Amino acid sequence: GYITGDMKEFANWLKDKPQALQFVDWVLRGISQVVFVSNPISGILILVGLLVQNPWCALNGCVGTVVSTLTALLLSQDRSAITAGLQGYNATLVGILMAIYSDKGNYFWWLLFPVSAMSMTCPVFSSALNSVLSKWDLPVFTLPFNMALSMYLSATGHYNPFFPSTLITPVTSVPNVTWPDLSALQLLKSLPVGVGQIYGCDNPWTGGIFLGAILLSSPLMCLHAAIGSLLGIIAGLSLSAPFEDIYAGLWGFNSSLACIAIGGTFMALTWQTHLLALACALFTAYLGASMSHVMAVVGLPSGTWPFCLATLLFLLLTTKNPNIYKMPISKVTYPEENRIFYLQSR
Amino acid sequence: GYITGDMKEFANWLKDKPQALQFVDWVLRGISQVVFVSNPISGILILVGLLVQNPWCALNGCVGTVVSTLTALLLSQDRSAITAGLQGYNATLVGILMAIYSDKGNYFWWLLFPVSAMSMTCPVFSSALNSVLSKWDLPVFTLPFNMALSMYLSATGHYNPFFPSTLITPVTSVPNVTWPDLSALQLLKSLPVGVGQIYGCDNPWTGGIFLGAILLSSPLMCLHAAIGSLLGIIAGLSLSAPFEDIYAGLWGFNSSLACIAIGGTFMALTWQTHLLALACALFTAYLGASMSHVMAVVGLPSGTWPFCLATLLFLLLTTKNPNIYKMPISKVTYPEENRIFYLQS
Amino acid sequence: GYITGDMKEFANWLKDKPQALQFVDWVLRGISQVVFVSNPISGILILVGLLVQNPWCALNGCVGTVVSTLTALLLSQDRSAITAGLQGYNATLVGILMAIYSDKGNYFWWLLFPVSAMSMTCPVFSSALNSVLSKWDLPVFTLPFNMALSMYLSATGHYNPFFPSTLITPVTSVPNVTWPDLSALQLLKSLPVGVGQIYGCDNPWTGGIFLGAILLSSPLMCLHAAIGSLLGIIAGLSLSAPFEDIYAGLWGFNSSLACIAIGGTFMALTWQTHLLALACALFTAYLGASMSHVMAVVGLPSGTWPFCLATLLFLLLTTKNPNIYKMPISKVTYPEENRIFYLQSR
Ligand SMILES: CCCCCCCCCCCCC/C=C\[C@@H](O)[C@H](CO)NC(=O)CCCCCCC
Ligand SMILES: CCCCCCCCCCCCC/C=C\[C@@H](O)[C@H](CO)NC(=O)CCCCCCC
Ligand SMILES: CCCCCCCCCCCCC/C=C\[C@@H](O)[C@H](CO)NC(=O)CCCCCCC
Ligand SMILES: CCCCCCCCO[C@@H]1O[C@H](CO)[C@@H](O)[C@H](O)[C@H]1O
Ligand SMILES: CCCCCCCCO[C@@H]1O[C@H](CO)[C@@H](O)[C@H](O)[C@H]1O
Ligand SMILES: CCCCCCCCO[C@@H]1O[C@H](CO)[C@@H](O)[C@H](O)[C@H]1O
Ligand SMILES: CCCCCCCCO[C@@H]1O[C@H](CO)[C@@H](O)[C@H](O)[C@H]1O
Ligand SMILES: CCCCCCCCO[C@@H]1O[C@H](CO)[C@@H](O)[C@H](O)[C@H]1O
Ligand SMILES: CCCCCCCCO[C@@H]1O[C@H](CO)[C@@H](O)[C@H](O)[C@H]1O
Ligand SMILES: CCCCCCCCO[C@@H]1O[C@H](CO)[C@@H](O)[C@H](O)[C@H]1O
Ligand SMILES: CCCCCCCCO[C@@H]1O[C@H](CO)[C@@H](O)[C@H](O)[C@H]1O
Ligand SMILES: CCCCCCCCO[C@@H]1O[C@H](CO)[C@@H](O)[C@H](O)[C@H]1O
Ligand SMILES: CCCCCCCCO[C@@H]1O[C@H](CO)[C@@H](O)[C@H](O)[C@H]1O
Ligand SMILES: OC[C@H]1O[C@@H](O)[C@H](O)[C@@H](O)[C@@H]1O
Ligand SMILES: OC[C@H]1O[C@@H](O)[C@H](O)[C@@H](O)[C@@H]1O
Ligand SMILES: OC[C@H]1O[C@@H](O)[C@H](O)[C@@H](O)[C@@H]1O
Ligand SMILES: OC[C@H]1O[C@@H](O)[C@H](O)[C@@H](O)[C@@H]1O
Ligand SMILES: OC[C@H]1O[C@@H](O)[C@H](O)[C@@H](O)[C@@H]1O
Ligand SMILES: OC[C@H]1O[C@@H](O)[C@H](O)[C@@H](O)[C@@H]1O
Ligand SMILES: OC[C@H]1O[C@@H](O)[C@H](O)[C@@H](O)[C@@H]1O
Ligand SMILES: OC[C@H]1O[C@@H](O)[C@H](O)[C@@H](O)[C@@H]1O
């Protein structure tokens, strides 16, 4: 009732309340915005899921969210966007993945310094990218996160004396894939792990929690999150990816995100638009593969660049099919509410 | 007369006729669009040239063209662009080059699955790139092809168990070049081989057939294709490229395309604009070496990125000289008819 | 008196007199535009600093400037920009760094051929980039130079039989940094060396001279040049860079340029923009590291790519703070005159 979707009522209720609680609320919506959700309860559930995988990653994610939100305020960015959590989600990722990609492991306190630095960067990236992309009425997605992360990880690299990153190298031989060995149960677990990997978690229970957090806000978003993850697995098997990479959900997170995006969030949901989302989800998985190989040559991970590039690409697609409709950015909420706008005008 | 230029007489006639015949027309015009030509007789001639070199590559080219054109229809893309062949050329290249860059050799039938998949992305890449580039009134050129190709070849790579690509590695030592062995005859043959390479064909006869196919539509385009190829050869020599790379036309195809593009087609042909096409063709050959080196590090070929980036760069150049005029995209056809618009505007 | 700032009085006097002096004026203003200065006395002084470092680089710089200026005239480019020197500074850099990155050493006379050819591409690169960037009211900065150089050095490479470039390879082990060895004297020298490295000069005297040339035109530009160089040093230390790299001013030149740009030149100088300039300079230094690692994998230097991208990113940041004001391109002079324009309309 009051804890579904955008929580419009709880938003209007807080407006008159203390600054501290209002701040905590924006942070939690910042966390949920990683999956296009603006819901503080979803934020709590996600944070819980993060504490379940790795309490270290949760801390860095939270520090990241706090610093960026505070930086957006220092730099007088738009209040609507802040309250909606749009100034926190990129730095939520910056903090988690910097911890994930650190060769120094859990509770390396020194990590907090470059996390804050890089989190402060996110409002700057967001603003700049917005100046360009809003001219086509495109969102920034997690481009701020991916630029910050690629920048940070290549500046340090595996051989930095203070902050070595994990070593990543290109493929240099044909992997042996034993097809009889392929487990049905393991593919099924890959689905929630693909979703877990959105926040860089490889735990199946965590991904289930994220699925639930999403479901609280929008069942349609939850559905596409799942399907996107599945399609990533399918693409993985089609190029003969090592099973262990599929099981770890590394083929599923970009696809999961792209599918949510196209499947009713940034395009109004119709059957044609649902087919479009599957296509985009597949395409993203294959671009994930491409970017992973190419970037490994420079010791970088692909991050969510593949999601950003493919999704932006599909949103710049135009058609003379009236059933394929791009939402105005200023009207973008969740699929259920988005669809009502489509039925009234198209 | 009827079989020259844009063939707009035959197109008007075909409009009333059966669906399947119209479709063959669009497919054939898609094939000729690789060299900016919208002519089904040129499409046929080019296809013959292809079937001559390697029927396997020819087949993949056609499957791409078909699948793309069908995807364009399925996704309600502009009709006129489809009928002009603008929705088939990128995938013609996707199919041919996916064959060239496969480590599996001829008639590896499975290759048809990814060729089809990648050919479906071509209308998507086209529309997305148009949404950006049309704001500066620029065409997308072969950017859809080059994106699709770089994506596919890097997602697979030389070490894919299913679809290995051919191994491509950077240069690791100074090539020994024996200058007395340089051959005028071989250099001269490198001219049509460079035009052949536009469709990934290293045969001088095939390249001759392509020049013939172009000439039928537009003598001026044919001339710039030849000139562009020549300038690429000059660029390779200027950089002491290994003779065999020059001989295989690898320095010629980007140059050739750039020279056609600037030399009458996207710029109105004047003596100034001709010099510009010469400059662009040189520049493009140089960028080709740059991109080939850099891309070899990640195991990719340069494709026709060089032509795409260089030509877009020269089209974005603004000048206060009235004799250097950029064609409005909606009024772009071939240099002979383009020049009439320029004189009458 | 008449030898500071634009020298708008002196240029108005030249508007009448012989073409060869007018041309020489443009070449000299072209040389100074490297550090955002349009002043021919500044140009002569910079030229002296180049001749002090290495006459061979100085020559190639000059061939660069002249050839590029001749080309912009041939291609009927805007004359206002030519007389201001905006058509010479990219090729000044092209000529100089082509000599620096040549593996053939001093007075390899054949080098003058591709220097001339790459200089001819500079106005082409400037115009096209202007076509795109002027839509957001942005300058091209040194993007023509950086495109020209990246293309040239990668088209040739270390293994080219005519024009081999110097060999650049990525980092492959953790360097050993002994902190007790850090030197105050060497660090102090790093500051002017950073400014010298804007023209690829590693001589502290040359960097001294360049500071003097800037000071002559705009003392506020001089201040930010020095601060930016210092912030790059601080960034280097913060990531435990090899001391010798910091001593060569390798961490200083990009951040120096960024600091001049934001700190009065393309943003009106206020307290707020001064701070923003310090942030942009730190940011630029870290991107320098990033771009250097990545571009070394393909055997290329970063050039001033980091400065170009960082500064453009900062010029695209919008805020609801009226103390942070972006200069209209048509209005940009030096910081002192810029601030006056701003205060009038504030
Ligand atoms: C349109 C007009 C406006 C222009 C505005 C300019 C915007 C400036 C953007 C500056 C962002 C640079 C930081 C991002 C990544 C870098 O760390 C490096 C660059 O090699 N990335 C890497 O090493 C790898 C990243 C590669 C990802 C592929 C990107 C498609
Ligand atoms: C302003 C709004 C527009 C936003 C639209 C976003 C468009 C994104 C395109 C996404 C598709 C990319 C596919 C092409 C190449 C990739 O596979 C990778 C990239 O790392 N290949 C490579 O590394 C090789 C590619 C190198 C070619 C040079 C690039 C100029
Ligand atoms: C908005 C629509 C208008 C589109 C207009 C197209 C503009 C065409 C510009 C293309 C010229 C670029 C050539 C420069 C350098 C290259 O040779 C090499 C290889 O890619 N650089 C490198 O390997 C290093 C490059 C690293 C720098 C990162 C670039 C962001
Ligand atoms: C504000 C400037 C921050 C830079 C200081 C970072 C200090 C790095 O910390 C160092 O890292 C070593 C290995 O990486 C560890 O063994 C030690 O904990 C520490 O000496
Ligand atoms: C979603 C589509 C996935 C297709 C995966 C094909 C699985 C069978 O793969 C087959 O396995 C054999 C040995 O087990 C190999 O010798 C064959 O090369 C291979 O095609
Ligand atoms: C859409 C999914 C396509 C899967 C097709 C996989 C094709 C596998 O191809 C296999 O390659 C082997 C080489 O290692 C050969 O020895 C086998 O004979 C061949 O069947
Ligand atoms: C296209 C302009 C470049 C001219 C370079 C030509 C150098 C080739 O050299 C020529 O090759 C001939 C082979 O046909 C030989 O007969 C000649 O002996 C030889 O001089
Ligand atoms: C535009 C006109 C195209 C010119 C085509 C010239 C083809 C010459 O081609 C040559 O043919 C010889 C046998 O005939 C072979 O021995 C050579 O290897 C081959 O290069
Ligand atoms: C369009 C410009 C073409 C370039 C022609 C270069 C001619 C190469 O000339 C060769 O250079 C070598 C030194 O590099 C010498 O050792 C050889 O004796 C000489 O013949
Ligand atoms: C535009 C074409 C320019 C051609 C430049 C030719 C450069 C000749 O390069 C020469 O090669 C010799 C043999 O390795 C070297 O010993 C010499 O140092 C070098 O000057
Ligand atoms: C821009 C036009 C200038 C072209 C001058 C090129 C002439 C080549 O100059 C040669 O360079 C060699 C390498 O340093 C020297 O060994 C020779 O002394 C010199 O003749
Ligand atoms: C801006 C960054 C702070 C600079 C750190 C200062 C470290 C200098 O260290 C000093 O170096 C001198 C050599 O010149 C030695 O004589 C001194 O003994 C030593 O303490
Ligand atoms: C301006 C920021 C200065 C950065 C902190 C410099 C102090 C370096 O601290 C050093 O950490 C090293 C771990 O790699 C140890 O080997 C050294 O013994 C220790 O002194
Ligand atoms: O807060 C959790 C604690 O976990 C331990 O493993 C770390 O060593 C402590 O530094 C940390 O405070
Ligand atoms: O984890 C790295 C280091 O972080 C520092 O902030 C703490 O003082 C140390 O206890 C710890 O070893
Ligand atoms: O009333 C809804 C109307 O909206 C328009 O924007 C559509 O193009 C019409 O075809 C439609 O009937
Ligand atoms: O056209 C398809 C067939 O071509 C023939 O020339 C070959 O013998 C076969 O291996 C191939 O499958
Ligand atoms: O070249 C591999 C091919 O082998 C044939 O026997 C199969 O029928 C094809 O589907 C397969 O792609
Ligand atoms: O200044 C011109 C002269 O300078 C000398 O130092 C070089 O060695 C010569 O190659 C050159 O002719
Ligand atoms: O590289 C570090 C070296 O610095 C010198 O100043 C010391 O005397 C050596 O003992 C030390 O090994
Ligand atoms: O007038 C400029 C001054 O403004 C104040 O707000 C700052 O605190 C000072 O540090 C600064 O020097």
Please write down the HEC assignment for all residues of chain C. CCCCCCCHHHHHHHCCCCHHHHHHHHHHHHHHHHHCCCCHHHHHHHHHHHHHHCHHHHHHHHHHHHHHHHHHHHCCCCHHHHHHCCCCHHHHHHHHHHHHCECCCCCCHHHHHHHHHHHHHHHHHHHHHHHHHHHHCCCCCCHHHHHHHHHHHHHHCCCCCCCCECCCCCCCCCCCCCHHHCCHHHHHHHHHHHHHHHHCCCCHHHHHHHHHHHHHHCHHHHHHHHHHHHHHHHHHHHCCCCHHHHHCCCCCHHHHHHHHHHHHHCECCCHHHHHHHHHHHHHHHHHHHHHHHHHHCCCCCCCCHHHHHHHHHHHCCCCCCCCCCECCHHHCCCHHHHHHHHHHHC
* Atom 8 of ligand 5, nearest CA residue: A179
Residue with tokens 């609320």: A25
Residue bearing the CA closest to ligand 6, atom 9: B162
Q: For residue C151, give both structure tokens.
A: 């293309």
Residue where the block lists tokens 């499975």: B110
CB C260 within 8 A of CB C224: yes
CA distance B257 to B276: 14
Q: Which residues of C touch A (CB under 8 A)?
A: 136, 171-175, 177, 238-240, 283, 286-287, 289-291, 293-294, 297, 312-314, 316-321
Report the top-level CATH class of A1-346: mainly alpha
| Residue A110 in contact with ligand 15 by CB distance below 6 A | yes
Cβ–ligand 5 distance for A234 under 6 Å, the answer yes
Nearest ligand 7 atom to the CA of B188 is 1
**Per-residue DSSP letters for A110-171?**
GGHHHHHHHHHHHHHHHHHHHHHHGGGT---TTHHHHHHHHHHHHHH-TT-SSSPBPP----
What residues of chain A lie within 8 A of the CB of B78, using their CB?
Answer: 320
- What DSSP character marks residue C317? -
Q: How many residues does chain C have?
A: 346
- Measured in Å, residue C243 CA sits from the centre of ligand 12 at 12
- Give the nearest partner residue to C283 out of A121, A161, A299, using CB atoms: A121
Task: Report the residue from A239, A289, A319 with minimal CB separation from B75.
Answer: A319
Which of B136, B177, B240 lies at the smallest CB-CB distance from C131?
A: B136
Q: Phi and psi at residue C237, in whole multiples of 5°?
A: -60, -40
Q: What gap in Å lies between CA A154 and CA A152, rounded to an integer? A: 6
Q: Which candidate, C132, A128, A324, A231, places its Cα nearest to that of B127?
A: A324
The number of beta carbons lying within 10 Å of the beta carbon of residue C137 is 14
**Tally of CB atoms within 10 A around A259:** 33
Distance CA(C289)–CA(C239), nearest Å, equals 9
Nearest CA among A27, A30, A37, A152 for reference residue A99: A152
Q: Which residues of C touch B291 (CB under 8 A)?
A: 154
Buried b (16+ CB within 10 A) or exposed e, B155-170: bbbbbbebbbbeebeb
Structure tokens at A137: 């009425």
B299: three-class secondary structure by DSSP: coil
CB contact under 8 A, C131 and B239: no
Paired with B188 in beta bridges are: none
Distance CA C152, CA C113 (A): 12
* Min Cα separation A70/chain B (Å): 34
| Interchain contact, C159 vs B177, CB within 8 Å | no
Angle at which helices A204-217 and A184-196 pack, to 10 degrees?
Answer: 60
Q: Is C177 helix (H, G, I), strand (E, B) or coil?
A: coil
Confirm or reject: Cβ of C147 under 6 Å from ligand 3.
yes
The rounded Cα B38 to chain-centroid distance in angstroms is 13
Contacts of B163 in chain A (CB under 8 A): 239
Q: Which residue owns the Cα nearest ligand 10 atom 17?
A: C162
Give all chains having 3 or more CB-to-CB distances under 8 Å with chain B: A, C
Residue B135 has a CB neighbour count (10 Å cut-off) of: 12
The structure's method of determination equals X-ray
The answer, yes or no, to whether any atom of ligand 11 lies below 6 A from the CB of C2, is no
Here the tokens at position B174 are 């100074």
CB B311 within 8 A of CB B302: no
Q: Hey, is B165 helix, strand or coil?
A: strand
Enumerate neighbours of C (3 or more CB pairs within 8 A). A, B
Q: Which residues are CB-contacts of C233 (< 8 A; sequence separation ≥ 6)?
A: C187, C190, C191, C194, C246, C251, C252
Cα(A166) to ligand 15 centroid in Å equals: 20
CB contact under 8 A, C152 and B290: yes
> Which CATH homologous superfamily contains domain B1-345?
Ammonium transporter AmtB like domains (1.10.3430.10)
Q: How many Cβ atoms from other residues are within 10 Å of residue B173's Cβ?
A: 7
Cα B179 to averaged position of ligand 11 atoms, centre (Å): 19
CB atoms C155 and B290 under 8 Å: yes
Shortest distance between the Cα of B135 and any Cα of chain C, in A, equals 10
d(CA B131, CA A132): 13
Residue type, position B197, single letter: Q
SS3 C326: strand
End-to-end, the C-alpha distance of chain C in Å comes to 29
Point out which residues pair with C102 in neighbouring strands. C165
* Site to substitute for ligand 13 among C181, C240, C243, C282, most atoms within 8 A of C-beta: C240
Angstrom distance (rounded) from CA B220 to CA A201: 60
Cβ(B238) – ligand 10 distance below 6 Å: yes
Q: Is the CB of A109 under 6 A from ligand 4?
A: no
Question: Are the CB atoms for A243 and A180 separated by under 8 Å?
Answer: no
* Distance in angstroms (rounded) separating the CA atoms of residues B255 and B287: 10
Q: Are C274 and A139 in contact (CB under 8 A)?
A: no
- Alpha carbons B11 and B21: distance in angstroms, whole number: 11
Kindly provide the resolution of this structure in angstroms, with one decimal. Answer: 2.5
The closest residue, in CA terms, to atom 24 on ligand 1 is A150
